[PDB]
Amino acid sequence: LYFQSNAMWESKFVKEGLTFDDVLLVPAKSDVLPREVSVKTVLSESLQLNIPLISAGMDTVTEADMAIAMARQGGLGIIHKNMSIEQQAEQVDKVKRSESGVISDPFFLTPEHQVYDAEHLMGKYRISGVPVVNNLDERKLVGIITNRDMRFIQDYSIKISDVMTKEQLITAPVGTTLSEAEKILQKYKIEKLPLVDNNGVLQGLITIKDIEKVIEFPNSAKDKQGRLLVGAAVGVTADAMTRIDALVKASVDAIVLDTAHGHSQGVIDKVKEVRAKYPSLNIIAGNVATAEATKALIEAGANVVKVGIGPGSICTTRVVAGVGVPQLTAVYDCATEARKHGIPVIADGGIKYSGDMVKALAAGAHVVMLGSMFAGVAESPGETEIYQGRQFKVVPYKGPLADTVHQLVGGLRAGMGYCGAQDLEFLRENAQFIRMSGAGLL
Amino acid sequence: LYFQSNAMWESKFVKEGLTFDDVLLVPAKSDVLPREVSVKTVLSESLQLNIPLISAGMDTVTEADMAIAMARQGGLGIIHKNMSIEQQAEQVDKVKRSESGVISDPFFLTPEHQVYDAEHLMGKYRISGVPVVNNLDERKLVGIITNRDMRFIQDYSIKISDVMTKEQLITAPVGTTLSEAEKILQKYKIEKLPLVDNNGVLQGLITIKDIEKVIEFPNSAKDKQGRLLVGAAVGVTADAMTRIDALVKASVDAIVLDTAHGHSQGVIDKVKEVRAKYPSLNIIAGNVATAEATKALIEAGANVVKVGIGPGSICTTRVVAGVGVPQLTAVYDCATEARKHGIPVIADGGIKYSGDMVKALAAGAHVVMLGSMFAGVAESPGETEIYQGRQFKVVPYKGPLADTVHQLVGGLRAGMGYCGAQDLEFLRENAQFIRMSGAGLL
Amino acid sequence: LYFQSNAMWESKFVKEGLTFDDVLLVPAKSDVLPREVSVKTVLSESLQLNIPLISAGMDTVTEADMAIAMARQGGLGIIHKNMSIEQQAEQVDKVKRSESGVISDPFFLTPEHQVYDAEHLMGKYRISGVPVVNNLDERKLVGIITNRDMRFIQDYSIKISDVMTKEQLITAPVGTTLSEAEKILQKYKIEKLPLVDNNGVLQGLITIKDIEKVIEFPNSAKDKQGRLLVGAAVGVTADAMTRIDALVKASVDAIVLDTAHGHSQGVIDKVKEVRAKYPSLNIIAGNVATAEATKALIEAGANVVKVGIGPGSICTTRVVAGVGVPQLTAVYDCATEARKHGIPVIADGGIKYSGDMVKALAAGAHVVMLGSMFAGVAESPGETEIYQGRQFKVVPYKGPLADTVHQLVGGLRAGMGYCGAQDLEFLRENAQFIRMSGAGLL
Amino acid sequence: LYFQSNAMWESKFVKEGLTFDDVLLVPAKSDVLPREVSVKTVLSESLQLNIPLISAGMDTVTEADMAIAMARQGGLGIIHKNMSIEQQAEQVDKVKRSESGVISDPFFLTPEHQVYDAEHLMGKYRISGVPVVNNLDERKLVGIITNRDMRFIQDYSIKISDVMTKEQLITAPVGTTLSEAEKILQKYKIEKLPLVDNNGVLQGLITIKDIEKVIEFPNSAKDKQGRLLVGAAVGVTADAMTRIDALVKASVDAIVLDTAHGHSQGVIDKVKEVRAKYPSLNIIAGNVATAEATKALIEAGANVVKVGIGPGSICTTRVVAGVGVPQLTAVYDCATEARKHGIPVIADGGIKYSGDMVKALAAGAHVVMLGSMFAGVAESPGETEIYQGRQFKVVPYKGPLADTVHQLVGGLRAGMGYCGAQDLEFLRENAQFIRMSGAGLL
């Protein structure tokens, strides 16, 4: 009575899937050394990473310090949502203002503010000077209070007019760039360069640190104005939009609309809704494990699709619900769909060693997301303690993020050398795998 | 000389089968939240469960206390056969009379009975009042002896005429329902409501507990008269019928005709025989692992087929006899046959975690049976002891049945959310699996 | 230039094979209870076993005591070749004469022999009487010296004429059978019945033990004259024939021409040679693992083919030489060839539990051979000691052979019940397997 | 727009590969005993081995003592490159001059040299005599200083003219062979036989040791002039040629141009370049794991191809880069290509037991290379120490190379017996494998 009414019944057991340990990458003809290989990857025009790594949006993984360390390495951190909306937008603000933060949109105080406000702004952003203007209306620059002024201030409750030295200031015009500022800073022997207009109105501030961080971290992943990229997690809930609004106002570069099952009508509706209010916002949506789910999220408006159901190290999804797809099959199936739209995928979960990362990228993902490999690095949230004669996060202490990133990227370049891939696109398009038994694993 | 005489020889090694750890369920488009999902399942018109769980017919698993706890949770207990016929029918009687038990067919005493008979009836059924009638012939209600009367009785050997307070009784008519009784009980401030006819003849009794248990356990699996469902195990033996007769007279809702190999002529004959004497009796017959065995038991008259040979945790069948079928293949093969007849299957054995249960239902079973997951819960038979600083059953103590059921059902709803299944029928019909290697398990 | 010159190169990796843990037997419709099932199997007209078990021809497994215990259970022992030719033929002689041994071909002494010769013959055969005749020429019976005569003899160096009581003897005629003898023994109240002809010439002896052992072991595997069956191992070497000659003269029922690689021209030549000198001798030849090797040994004249290369528990063949075939594939491939000739196969090696035995028979073997499962039973060679608070063979002590056989056969009957097999032929012809993953094993 | 533009994408997961534990060799008809089997193998006309074993070019495996022990056993050692060019050529020189070293191109001293130079030459080569000539121009033999002369010399700083006994010397002509020399040495009762021309000019030296070593090691792998074969590792680097030049001048028999990824344009260019400068030099090039890489190295001019990426015991290649091919598939795929050119392959890495070696040769390699199986033998580099009550290399001490070689070759002959292979060519061409599950491994 119905065409192939028994089709769904008969296909129950047909699909097979492969995980990382089921395969190896086959060496191919290579003209390129691992060090000359390119690890850059573009998630979109406004998200351009210099290494294909994202730190997960978990409370044991990414807050502002992690997001800053990641972007400095060329990757992207995703600030977790296990805090209030204001706290999350503030975390975003700290990443965006870490460097090149106040060049076009400076903070400032009047002489009538207390030295407390200076300590607050310098503590909050880790910027060592606060411009001072005559009043909040004209905003004419009368001076600056710096970390060096604070050396001599005992009580902080006093007016800034009291403590402010009236000294000859060096200013530069609006539009002064970093490399120009570096010369002006070198010339007059100063660490701070307020930018003003023709009327003496403060438009901006450049610091020696804005210049030093460019040198210290040449691989930083930055926006068009030179500020570190940052993402932020958002749940699918009634208040998602309120949360997104505050993040966008804090100048977040991407939101991750994250849920256990991305293939639900609620998630699709939420992406449609966020896409409509914000045509240009980078929307990473997940989590999905099928070609059909990938197509639905893309057509709802997601521009990055996040892949993985069940592979996560601490996910009970497989044991409790019986649900999952082996991660390489999931990445490959989703990338097969997403390729047709020009849409990149993130491989989220189940990565143990750098080799797994190489495999995930070779199976078609543009980028991998790591929680557990990053949870013990120094910049992750949570305190250090010594307990077993061992330093711990309160999980084994891994040291600075940079050491872990360096090993991951080293592994990736090696893998790329073997596969003859000069860049990640060639790797996704061309790399071949060979399947092996469990005996082939040992 | 014979058509395909070598066919049986050549097919020896052809079949493959899959067990729980060989597969995962694939997420599908979902419009439905895990909490709004329906876990109800119908085994037949007279057996309707509110969660798809049955407690096994083993002496370490199910006696009256377990059967009562299970049915209260919405499932079904199967009283084991490792006791005498009278003991088993009595166990059945206790479950059926746990609540709403005496509404149409009350127990009663005369004034000439001893208070011992009252203690016995109240102990046996956990019902706190015993109606008293003038004589066994007219059965005219003269009073009631309750748990509160017993507070003041020291010696129990005395006549009930001595101890019975002559007090104004409140009675209601035959056909009074629970929700009516609740109002009458509230109004006159009483805990017991004998039901009588126009001549004062006792027809029944309702208690506040009959009303309270409906509220306390809104998911109870009950018969048409509001009594807890119960099953009972029967062996295939010469005295099976004698045993079945007593169980049916005790108002059992199903019998499980249980044997190691259900595919034997003796079992088929026994089902034919029981079906013939009792056209309406629910007959669960097992155990089978093939489509052919399923068809034979169905045509013999079984209305539920029990599936599993060798997967049971304590079965030596695989090691000793070399025999078995991987449980998901068994469930699927049997359900493929049983679907054609509109007959449900029970997946019996080999379930470790809730995920396995989700998989068994997704492979086509209507219901799973669990022995070992239930053997340590409080309501299972056997005493508590402390031994290793650990509470034990004399096996690790799992606490109340309700805690274990809550985790199982939580896992099931999650799995159903992932698969987009609003109800168990959709799950059986539509859920897809993906096969994975042993590396995909880790 | 050559037809398919690359065929051998391209087929290198094509074959797959299965071992015991790769499969389970599928239950089939059964009309037959495990206890009414027949476990008999015929290796040839002159070798008919009552259980399908053979004890291996290893020095830690089978000497006369083991061979006797095995045949009593219905199986066959194979006396190992790690002794001299005379020692091996003597071991064979002890098995054949264990019961019904001296009925047609008696030992005897004259009065001039010492009591030492009586002790020797009674010790050697465990027969408690020695017939005495007047001289080696007439062989006329003058009396008998028994275990009871020995009670009173202190010095054994004396002439038998001295110690022999002249007492009225009861004799029976030649051709007297056991059941007749039992009545004559009961009637005259005696334990020994010499058989003589019309002239008083000793032809034979029957003892109460010949009669008692028939009752004690109703399943004994016996030859046409009522003596226990026994086999013996022979190597392929220059002196094989000399060894075979002595075994045949000792009335061995089978020889096992045993070598690591049975598929060699030397083995085939040796079978051809032994077949030619002894047209009726049972020749078990091995070891082979392929259909082609099975055909070659059969056409060389072997009437039983022994199967297994590498599965043996203590074989290093797989690790050292890299060689082997998974045992069930080997059994099946060899049985496929051997079936065409009406030739039975023995599955030798790799059996751990009774389930494996059921599987080997279901894959087509008529009989399984066990070394390591038997090496600790009481009747195996080697002394008992207590060492770790544990009794040991000098390997864990398993107790009497009968206990191990009873568990094996119990497992076999169960398996046969499940498969609906009334006899081993039906099992070989009809049993089906299902393949499972390593996850299906756990 | 492009023919099969999606082909590379769709083939990603198609290949399967097998490692040693995935398979066993199938026994085949055999006419040949393991001891009469030939284990010889030809890598080229100028490299002819008597056992198919090469010791790896690692600093924990092969220096001069190892290379000498290996060639004496019939195999080939590869001197590692983790030393300077001069040190490596010197190591090569010691192997080539170990025996038959000075027959055509002798070292010599004048009377004006110190006894220090004699000690040096005798220490360096382990040759117990140094010819002495009148001057470096005529090179007329005036005498010889031997190990026996040194017994009486206390101070070594003295002129050789002082210490040299003027004694009647026995000389033989140029072209005198070893077997001739043996007779002359026996006849005149001497241990040293200088070879001279008609004018008394030293052309050469034969020692009793040159003769004794032929007897002691009848299986030595030697060049055309009777000197032990030796190989040497070279990296692909700017100074490779400078290194190769010195090795060729030291009369190396092969170079191994060794790199992690042999399939790179740099390696191919380097082979082309070395092939062009040295048309006759044996070039072993690696490492490759594919048919395409094998063809490229062969056409670049390599005459031996080395196979294996990732199987090496201490390689992190699989875990770190995610790259590799299961070793038997790699050997088979490469041998399939190399067969077409008449080119042999070396199976490098992943060999644990002798069985694995048999499998690698049966999959098509002419020879296996072993690092880790040899790293603890006595002749490997590094000191002995006792630490845990255990002798160690500073890794468990394996004793003399000869003991390990004897077990490997024993395993190989056994495997060859089973496969019916009289020689390694037949094994490569004809041996068949059977695939097994992980359950078939246990």
Ligand SMILES: O=c1[nH]cnc2c1ncn2[C@@H]1O[C@H](COP(=O)(O)O)[C@@H](O)[C@H]1O
């Ligand atoms: O609490 C959980 N519920 C659902 N998914 C989780 C949870 N924790 C982690 N994950 C997922 O697993 C990933 C972590 O991958 P990891 O590198 O294997 O630990 C996260 O980015 C999430 O996608």
Ligand SMILES: O=c1[nH]cnc2c1ncn2[C@@H]1O[C@H](COP(=O)(O)O)[C@@H](O)[C@H]1O
């Ligand atoms: O004694 C046994 N003999 C045969 N089957 C058994 C026995 N014990 C348990 N079983 C089976 O195994 C099931 C228990 O499944 P479990 O949840 O894995 O322990 C029971 O419901 C029976 O079907």
Ligand SMILES: O=c1[nH]cnc2c1ncn2[C@@H]1O[C@H](COP(=O)(O)O)[C@@H](O)[C@H]1O
């Ligand atoms: O020493 C050995 N060399 C070759 N085959 C052996 C040896 N020991 C035992 N076997 C074989 O392995 C069988 C024993 O099987 P088991 O029951 O697994 O121990 C014997 O009957 C022989 O076929």
Ligand SMILES: O=c1[nH]cnc2c1ncn2[C@@H]1O[C@H](COP(=O)(O)O)[C@@H](O)[C@H]1O
């Ligand atoms: O340091 C390493 N880097 C790359 N390859 C290596 C290294 N060490 C050993 N190998 C390879 O692994 C082989 C050793 O094989 P083994 O017998 O498994 O230890 C060597 O001959 C090399 O081909």
